[PDB]
Write a protein that binds this ligand. Structure first.
Ligand SMILES: N[C@@H](CCC(=O)O)C(=O)O
Ligand SMILES: N[C@@H](CCC(=O)O)C(=O)O
Lengths: 54, 108, 54, 54
C-alpha cells in the first residue's frame, strides 16, 4: 500500500489470530488494561490510528 | 458427584435448531447445530455432563434503562440461574462489566 | 446459502467484533473453558464445523 | 528488546528467548508489541482481548 508498491499479494488469509497487550502474571493491571483496550476499540480510536498509518 | 451443568442458550439457525423429530425425541437430542457441537466438544474436553436450557424472554438484551436490572442471556447468568452460556453473544464493554468472556472464536 | 436466494448482501463491513464463550464472573469453569476454546481454535475444529454448517 | 526476536520456547531446553523471555524472567513490566496470542504463551503471561485480526 506504500511505495515502491512493486510486489503483488496472492491468496487470502489461511487462518485468523490476534495481537494483545501482555504482562507478567504478577500484577493487577490486567483488568484496567482490558477496559482501556475495550474503550479505545469502542471509541473508534483504533480506526483513526489505522487510517493514519496504512 | 458430577453435576449436570445448567447450560443456557437461544434458538437460532444454524446455531441451535429444533430437530424435525422433536415431537418424538427427548433430552438434548432435540437440539442440534453449530453451538450444540461446540458445547459437546467443550464438555468432552472439560469432562462433565451437561443439560441444555433455553432463554426465558428470547432476548440477548442489556440492563434496563434507569434501573440497571439485568435480563436476557446476561440476566440468567447474573442471577445465577445457569452455569455457562454458549450463544451468539457479542463481546461488549457493558457485558464485560459483569460476566467474563473467552478469547473470541469468531469475528463478524 | 439457502433457497430461494431472493435477497443479497451489499457493501463492506462497518466494523469488526467477536463472539465468545461467557461465564459468570470468576467461576472455576472460566479458565479451563478458555483453554479448551484456545485448543479447539488451534486444531481448527471450529472451521470444520463452520464448513459443515454453512 | 535486547536481541530483536519475538521469541518462543527454546529447543526443549525450556528456556525462553526474546521478548517473552524478557517478561518471564522479569526484565520488563509490560510488552507493547505485535505479540501473537498462542496457547503456549498463555501459559506464562496474560493477554487482553485482541485489538486486531490477521
Ligand atoms: N450478537 C449480538 C446479537 C444481537 C445484535 O446485536 O444484533 C449480541 O450479543 O447482542
Ligand atoms: N506477531 C507475530 C510475529 C511473527 C509472525 O508470526 O510473523 C508473533 O508474535 O509471533
Amino acid at each position: 500500500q506504500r511505495k515502491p508498491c512493486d510486489t503483488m499479494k496472492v491468496g487470502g488469509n489461511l487462518d485468523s489470530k490476534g495481537y494483545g497487550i501482555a504482562t507478567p502474571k504478577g500484577s493487577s493491571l490486567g483488568t484496567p488494561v482490558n477496559l482501556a483496550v475495550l474503550k479505545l476499540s469502542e471509541q473508534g480510536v483504533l480506526d483513526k490510528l489505522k487510517n493514519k498509518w496504512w | 458427584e458430577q453435576k449436570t451443568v445448567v447450560v443456557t442458550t437461544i434458538l437460532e439457525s444454524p446455531y441451535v435448531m429444533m430437530k424435525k423429530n422433536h415431537e418424538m425425541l427427548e433430552g438434548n437430542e432435540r437440539y442440534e447445530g453449530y453451538c450444540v457441537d461446540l458445547a459437546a466438544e467443550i464438555a468432552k474436553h472439560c469432562g462433565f455432563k451437561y443439560k441444555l436450557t433455553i432463554v426465558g424472554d428470547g432476548k440477548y438484551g442489556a440492563r434496563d434503562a434507569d434501573t440497571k436490572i439485568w435480563n436476557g442471556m446476561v440476566g440468567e447468568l447474573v442471577y445465577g440461574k445457569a452455569d455457562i452460556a454458549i450463544a451468539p453473544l457479542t463481546i461488549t464493554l457493558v457485558r464485560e462489566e459483569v460476566i467474563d468472556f473467552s478469547k473470541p472464536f469468531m469475528s463478524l
